[PDB]
Amino acid sequence: AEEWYFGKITRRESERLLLNPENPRGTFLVRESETTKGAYCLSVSDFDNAKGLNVKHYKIRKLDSGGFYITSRTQFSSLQQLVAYYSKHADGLCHRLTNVCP
Amino acid sequence: CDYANFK
To answer: Quick one: fold of A1-102?
Structure first.
């Protein structure tokens, strides 16, 4: 029911969705590996004058002790905590997460 | 292909 979770959408279909010019910087979605349940990626739209509209994909790593992270220095207890956090602060990303991908 | 990363 998470507006931003798109299940097993492929990398290519996720870029086609996110690359739409009406998506503001930071539009994003979370997707899952097709084979590995629980293995997630955060796909996000961005823009700069070098690459123009582009999509960045971050593997959402899992610690053995449980937990999720896209950069090891910032650990979360769940996907919702992580998405909530980067929606408030870029904290290293080029831009904070904004619109859930439509 | 490729997976972004940041410090």
So the answer is: SHC Adaptor Protein (3.30.505)
Domain spans in chain A, listed from the N-terminal domain onward: 1-102
Rounded distance, CA A34 to CA A32, Å? 6
- This entry's atomic model was obtained through X-ray
Residues of B in contact with A56 (CB under 8 A): 4
At what resolution in Å was this solved? Answer: 1.6
Instruction: For residue A11, count other CB atoms closer than 10 A to its CB.
Output: 14
Q: Are B6 and A57 within 8 A, CB to CB?
A: no
Residues A47, A39: Cα–Cα separation, whole Å: 26
